[PDB]
């Protein structure tokens, strides 16, 4: 047969199915399963037909400097395949494929069997103080030694590399990409080495390890945007064990939703459970892995379009926000119930938040507001500060909007606030630091990008991350003009510049994950 | 001879000079005379050699959707010329050319001699209520009828079309592009028609007409980034009459600066003079055109890196800011002196500002702050409010940072504030409106982008512009996803939606210039 779309170059039924398979294996992680866009732009026929075949071939062939791979000049895709892809994205988007146990098992690779792995750490690295750094546009992670401020390893994962997580033993580093590829890295090998890989879906954002006491390295979980599902895997091998669909009913209208994406997963410390946020249906699932054949799930209704979330300081209450809402949902992971919906007056910015002790209000959890740069504080201690629990107690004011990350550490007296997307260049190039011992005082500004010494041009600073001791804070810096990058390290006790990590291998550093602080949910 | 650069494909001395001529005629308006970038990205060899010949050819050939023309697929440039350009931008940037009276006169075209033009308005348009709208990526302006809300004419100018200005008679519309091309349009023709064109430099931003009483249509002035100069032309024909270099000594170090760009030009109402801001040397020039053969210029030292500025409500004091400064310079255009340097505590955002009467402080001029969305008010009435003159008297707070334009009108009780570059989508898609009769009250938010009804996707709203009566406010809206655009019209007395202008010819509408309000400096 012939596939035809108004205004599109007709294709063979075989050409279309070949392009379909390429699209969902290689493109959908960034462009979406219905091509509506995510990290990458929309590729629906209204837009692509306006660009035309030859423009589309050119873009796919050479890529762009802002994260679109050069599929042709890389050799990843053939001239003929690129022509097929340029034709394909001008046709109506088809139904995306499913991805079950057969597809997962076919993608599963064990490079080093558990019995062939070392019995102890064979390298001499200070593993808890390693930083795993995403090299966004290079499809790699870099392992950076926190003590010597040197790159010690670079590891290929794939385009669309996203985040790193740690197993509860501290031995295994887990990386997931937006195409739902997972890599498992053994930090005890003579040089840290990939030991297993698997693909759990077409599009994904989240991975996590089992962190309840006694379950170290037992299970790894991953959540997909498409298909709407999460998968529980063997923590030692990534062998897929259980797959659970998240298709289902919405919390607000109780009508069936055909694509409830998994937004985020964190690991419970109160029970052997994973906390799974399901976005469109607005459900927080507590998934119990004490028995994975007789699988227990508690579904807590929260609010539609759930985003990220994070633990409070006690690791009991899960603080989460939904888009289009001024409320923070508080899930009690111990009693397995919704505890509160906290009005913070403004829309909270998705993220783990930042926990610290307010001298007056006691333990608080904090969230930023993207538009105006304010930060809301919520009391999180029903035991000793019941008069403040699940209430907004205060508001701090940063330099302005555009913050992506706020960060503290239990051993630090400072709160760091970036302003990556602020439209003023001096503010996007700097970070605000609040004194937790005098929260009535204005923040101080650290000139992070200037310290990086990267030449003239637009520089953006992102994501404060502490070292294992809590006495250094690391920042990613990148000059959009010349492709140049650095990690800037501040002494948290003095607020002085301590080090600048520069290396040609440090390509578009974005997320930085300190091993200890990621393993132990320290924020 | 052979031109060679480390890492660049060698070129014929003739090929290089051919590419040089193309670069400075067609590319430098956006990419800069030393290729350091302006509207378009930097094209210095460090960056271009990393991209490589074939990527560079592809980009030049097909362009990009964010304002880089498709030189090859347009037919503007040959395959051979595009190869030469891709080689050329990998070589060391050469010295840019000069552009004097011979070059200006060679570019000068009179399409309709003044004696052949109509003696009165032959079309039936309400000319004072026309809006001249920049169609940024189309190289055109659209004339939109303020009464019927319909496009009535579309006029080609060139890529990099920038702003519109009006002659003091109300008859001639002046358009300048970033390549320093000027078009003069006769609004009295049966259909408004280009009557003259000229090129006054390689790179430019500003054009203005003579507005002192009695000099209607006598002179047009334009200022260039490169060469560092301004040119005075005959107001009826654009014939070049006088060219003045702005090369000279800096205000702060009194050392010679070889490229002092003309930042902005406005027209004096106190004297037959143009006010010319010279950026790097920090000089405000009062250029007197009573006698242009015996040319008098008063040079007022202000501050380095002068930007835009605007008149106060009385059209006597020129309010201007320099980058990297918390001060607003006040130039008295009547007495021809610096009046004050007003500390507003934060960096003012370049712009004309907004004038209104504060019930307590009297006439004030207002400026926004890009980072945090605040607005500073300065008293501008030494006669009746001397206790507030040249002092910051108050601060308003908008939705957040990212404002590009604030706007009022003497017949309006509202102040409008866009937030085009705010990182929160709801804020960038809306505008704040303050009640000038109750400035203690919080602003109201108008959902401008939602009213435009442009489908899902990132939409940005920019530049409130009033109609001639002051009772409508117009906004440009554009959906980045689908290329779709609208002008949204609000009833200023009710703050209700009044009209939505949609037309496939409305491609990337940016600046909107109401004829009457531009002619009479009404802001
Ligand atoms: C994330 C790592 C991506 C993957 C994998 C793919 N694409 Fe992509 N693409 C991505 C981005 C961030 C962008 C925008 C970059 C820009 O500079 O703004 C793009 C762009 C495209 C386009 C152009 C869209 C347009 O001009 O409107 C096309 C045609 C495109 N991408 C296609 C495409 C294909 C077919 C891919 C699989 C082979 C693919 N992309 C992968 C990000 C990412
Ligand atoms: C303004 C109207 C422009 C004119 C005239 C020219 N260019 Fe341009 N260019 C412009 C922009 C806004 C951009 C960036 C667009 C993007 O999508 O972000 C560009 C880009 C380029 C590039 C690519 C740079 C890179 O990938 O780093 C090149 C090689 C380039 N432009 C070359 C070029 C030439 C040779 C031109 C004259 C023939 C030219 N541009 C004109 C804006 C504008």
Provide the sign of the torsion angle of the four alpha carbons B71, B74, B75, B80, taken in this order: positive
Residues B260-296: b if buried by 16+ CB within 10 A, e if exposed:
bbbbbbbbbbbebbbbbbbbbbbbbbbbbbeeeeeee
Closest CA to A283 of A258, A308, A249, A255: A249
Q: Which single residue is written with the structure tokens 């501040």? A: A490
Q: Torsion-angle region of residue B466: left (phi > 0), alpha (psi -120 to 50) or beta? A: beta
Q: What is the distance in A from the centroid of ligand 2 to the CA of B90?
A: 14
> What is residue A145's three-state secondary structure?
strand
Distance CA B32, CA B40 (A): 8
Provide the residue ranges of all domains of chain A, joining segments of one domain with +: 1-96, 97-523
CA of B192, closest CA in chain A: separation in Å? 31
Distance CA B340, CA A485 (A): 42
Closest CA to B361 of B340, B382, B331, B338: B382
The answer to whether B183 and B139 have CB atoms below 8 angstroms apart is no
Distance CA A161, CA A174 (A): 11
Q: What are phi and psi of B477, to 5 degrees?
A: -130, 145
Q: What are the structure tokens assigned to A409, written together?
A: 């550490």
Q: What are the structure tokens assigned to B143, written together?
A: 């004339």
Distance CA B479, CA B463 (A): 15
Catalytic residue among A315, A349, A369, A414: A349
Rg (CA), chain B: 23
Rg (CA), chain A: 23
Q: Is there a catalytic annotation at residue B30?
A: yes
Of all helices (H) and strands (E), which one includes residue A59?
helix A53-62
Q: What are the structure tokens assigned to A312, written together?
A: 């409070």
Using CB atoms, which residue from B50, B61, B372 is nearest to A483? B50
Distance CA A128, CA A125 (A): 9
Ligand 2 atom nearest to B29, measured from its CA? 5
Q: What are the structure tokens assigned to A260, written together?
A: 């409830």
The answer to whether B249 and B256 have CB atoms below 8 angstroms apart is yes
> What is residue B65's three-state secondary structure?
coil
Distance CA B214, CA B222 (A): 20
Q: Is there a catalytic annotation at residue B414?
A: no
Of all helices (H) and strands (E), which one includes residue A430?
none
Closest CA to A367 of A332, A396, A409: A396
Residue B14 makes CB contacts below 8 A (sequence gap 6+) with none
> What is residue B404's three-state secondary structure?
coil
10 Å CB burial of residue B386 (0-12, 13-18, 19+) is exposed
Give me the half-sphere count of Cα atoms (radius 13 Å) on the Cβ side of residue A375.
30
Distance CA A489, CA A498 (A): 5
Distance CA B435, CA B155 (A): 38
Provide the sign of the torsion angle of the four alpha carbons B153, B407, B285, B321, taken in this order: negative
Q: Torsion-angle region of residue B192: left (phi > 0), alpha (psi -120 to 50) or beta? A: beta
Q: What does each C-alpha distance from A36 to A31, A52, A389, B277 come to in angstroms? A: 7, 18, 41, 46
CA angle B417, B458, B503 (to 5 degrees): 85
Q: Euclidean distance between the first and final Cα of chain B, in Å?
A: 57
Q: What is the distance in A from the centroid of ligand 2 to the CA of B134?
A: 19
Distance CA A150, CA A130 (A): 10
Q: What are the structure tokens assigned to A413, written together?
A: 């007296």
> What is residue B516's three-state secondary structure?
helix
> What is residue B127's three-state secondary structure?
helix
DSSP E strand boundaries for A27-125:
109-110
Residue B371 makes CB contacts below 8 A (sequence gap 6+) with A399, A400, A422, A423, A424, A426, A427, B346, B347, B401
Distance CA B27, CA B196 (A): 23
Neighbours of B130 (CB within 10 A): 25
Find chain B residues with C-beta within 8 A of A422's C-beta. 371, 401, 423
Distance CA A141, CA A187 (A): 13
Length of chain A: 523
Q: What are the structure tokens assigned to B134, written together?
A: 């920049």
Distance CA A71, CA A67 (A): 12
Q: What are the structure tokens assigned to A443, written together?
A: 């923040």
Give me the half-sphere count of Cα atoms (radius 13 Å) on the Cβ side of residue A251.
21
The answer to whether B172 and B186 have CB atoms below 8 angstroms apart is yes
Q: What does each C-alpha distance from B177 to A383, B40, B259, B281 come to in angstroms? A: 67, 14, 20, 24
Q: What are phi and psi of A50, to 5 degrees?
A: -65, -35
Q: What are the structure tokens assigned to A522, written together?
A: 């320290």
Q: What is the distance in A from the centroid of ligand 1 to the CA of B496?
A: 40
In this structure, the dihedral spanned by the alpha carbons of residues A245, A246, A247 and A249, taken in order and rounded to 10 degrees, is 140
Catalytic residue among A31, A269, A369, A385: A31
CA of A324, closest CA in chain B: separation in Å? 9
Distance CA B285, CA B277 (A): 6
Q: How far is C-alpha B517 from the chain's CA centre? A: 15
Q: How far is C-alpha A352 from the chain's CA centre? A: 10
Q: What are the structure tokens assigned to A324, written together?
A: 């289009």
Closest CA to A463 of A517, A411, A393, A395: A517
Residue A57 makes CB contacts below 8 A (sequence gap 6+) with A72, A82, A83, A86
The answer to whether A23 and A92 have CB atoms below 8 angstroms apart is no
Q: Is there a catalytic annotation at residue A233?
A: no
The B181-186 sheet, strands edge to edge: B109-110, B193-199, B181-186, B172-177, B161-166
Partners of A416 in the beta sheet? A407, A433
Neighbours of B147 (CB within 10 A): 12
Q: What is the distance in A from the centroid of ligand 1 to the CA of A159?
A: 11
DSSP string, A148-205: T--EEEEEE--TTEEEEEE-TTS-EEEEEETTSEEEEEETTSSS-EEEEEEE--SEEE
Partners of B299 in the beta sheet? B285
Q: What does each C-alpha distance from B87 to B1, B12, B46, B90, B160 come to in angstroms? A: 16, 11, 13, 5, 23
Distance CA B521, CA B365 (A): 14
Q: What are the structure tokens assigned to A78, written together?
A: 């053939």
Distance CA B92, CA B83 (A): 17
Q: What are the structure tokens assigned to B275, written together?
A: 């006010």
Whose atoms come closest to the Cα of A24: which ligand? 1
Closest CA to A18 of A99, A77, A100, A106: A77
Q: Which single residue is written with the structure tokens 């070589």? A: B91
DSSP string, B323-370: TT-SEEEEEETTTTEEEEEEE-SSPPPSS--EEEEETTTEEEEEEE-T
Residue A237 makes CB contacts below 8 A (sequence gap 6+) with A110, A113, A114, A196
Which residue of B21, B28, B29, B41 sits with most ligand 2 atoms within 8 Å of its CB, as the best mutation to test the pocket? B41
Length of chain B: 523
Q: What does each C-alpha distance from B279 to B304, B344, B457 come to in angstroms? A: 6, 20, 38
Distance CA B267, CA B477 (A): 30
The answer to whether B317 and B331 have CB atoms below 8 angstroms apart is yes
The answer to whether B363 and B312 have CB atoms below 8 angstroms apart is yes
Instruction: Please state whether the peptide bond connecting residue A468 to the residue before it is cis, i.e. omega within 30 degrees of 0.
Output: no
Distance CA A29, CA B397 (A): 40
Give me the half-sphere count of Cα atoms (radius 13 Å) on the Cβ side of residue B486.
19
Strands B431-435 and B414-417: antiparallel
Please answer yes or no on whether B46 and A482 come within 8 Å at the CB atom. yes
Distance CA A20, CA A89 (A): 9
Residue A466 makes CB contacts below 8 A (sequence gap 6+) with A407, A409, A412, A472, A473, A474, A492, A514, A517, A522
Q: Chain A residues within 8 A (CB-CB) of chain B?
A: 37, 42, 46-47, 50-51, 54-55, 58, 61-62, 65, 73, 347, 370-373, 399-402, 421-424, 426-427, 457, 481-483
Strands A240-245 and A248-249: unpaired
Nearest residue (by CA) to ligand 1, atom 7, is A68
> What is residue B78's three-state secondary structure?
coil
Closest CA to A465 of A164, A191, A263: A164
DSSP E strand boundaries for B138-201:
140-145, 151-156, 161-166, 172-177, 181-186, 193-199
Q: Which single residue is written with the structure tokens 């080495």? A: A193
């Amino acid at each position: 047969h012939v596939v035809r779309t108004n205004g599109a170059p007709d294709m063979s039924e075989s050409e279309f199915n070949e392009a379909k398979q390429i699209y969902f294996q290689r493109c959908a992680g960034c462009h979406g399963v219905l091509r509506k866009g995510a990290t990458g732009k929309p590729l629906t026929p209204d837009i692509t037909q306006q660009r035309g075949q030859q423009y589309l071939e050119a873009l796919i062939t050479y890529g762009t400097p802002l994260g679109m791979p050069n599929w042709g000049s890389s050799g990843e895709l053939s001239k003929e395949q690129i022509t097929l892809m340029a034709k394909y994205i001008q046709h109506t988007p088809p139904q995306p494929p499913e991805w079950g146990m057969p597809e997962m098992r076919e993608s599963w690779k064990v490079l080093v069997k558990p019995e062939d792995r070392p019995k102890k750490q064979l390298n001499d690295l200070d593993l808890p103080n390693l930083f795993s750094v995403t090299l966004r546009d290079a499809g790699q992670i870099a392992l950076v030694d926190g003590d010597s401020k040197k790159i010690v390893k670079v590891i290929d994962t794939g385009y669309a590399v996203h985040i790193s997580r740690m197993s509860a033993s501290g031995r295994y580093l887990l990386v997931i990409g937006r195409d739902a590829r997972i890599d498992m890295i053994d930090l005890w090998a003579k040089e840290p080495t990939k030991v297993a890989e698997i693909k759990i879906g077409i599009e994904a954002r989240s991975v996590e390890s089992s962190k309840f006491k006694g379950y170290e390295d037992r299970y790894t979980i991953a959540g997909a945007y498409w298909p709407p599902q999460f998968a529980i895997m063997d923590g030692e091998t990534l062998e897929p064990k259980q797959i659970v669909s998240t298709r289902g009913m919405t919390v607000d209208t109780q009508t069936y939703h055909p694509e409830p994406r998994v937004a985020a997963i964190i690991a419970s410390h109160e029970h052997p459970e994973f906390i799974v946020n399901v976005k469109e249906t607005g459900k927080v699932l507590l998934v119990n892995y004490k028995d994975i054949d007789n699988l227990t799930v508690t579904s807590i209704g929260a609010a539609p379009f759930l985003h990220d979330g994070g633990w409070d300081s006690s690791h009991r209450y899960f603080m989460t926000a939904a888009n289009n809402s001024n409320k923070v949902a508080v899930i009690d992971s111990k009693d397995r119930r919704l505890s509160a919906l906290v009005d913070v007056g403004k829309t909270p910015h998705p993220g783990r938040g930042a926990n610290f002790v307010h001298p007056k209000y006691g333990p608080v959890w904090s969230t930023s507001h993207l538009g105006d740069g304010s930060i809301s504080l919520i009391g999180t201690d029903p035991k000793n500060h019941p008069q403040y629990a699940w209430k907004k107690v205060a508001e701090l004011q940063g330099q302005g909007g555009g913050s992506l990350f706020i960060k503290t550490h239990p051993k630090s007296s400072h709160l760091y606030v970036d302003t990556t997307f602020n439209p003023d260049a001096r503010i996007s190039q700097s970070v605000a630091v609040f004194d937790l011992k005098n929260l009535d005082a204005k923040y101080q500004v650290l000139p992070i990008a200037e310290w990086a010494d990267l030449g003239e041009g637009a520089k953006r600073v992102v994501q404060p991350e502490y070292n294992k001791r809590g006495d250094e804070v690391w920042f990613s810096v990148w000059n959009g003009k010349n492709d140049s990058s650095a990690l800037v390290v501040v002494d948290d006790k003095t607020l002085k510049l301590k080090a600048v990590v520069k290396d040609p291998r440090l390509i578009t550093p974005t997320g930085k994950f300190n091993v200890y602080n990621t393993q132990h949910d320290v924020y």
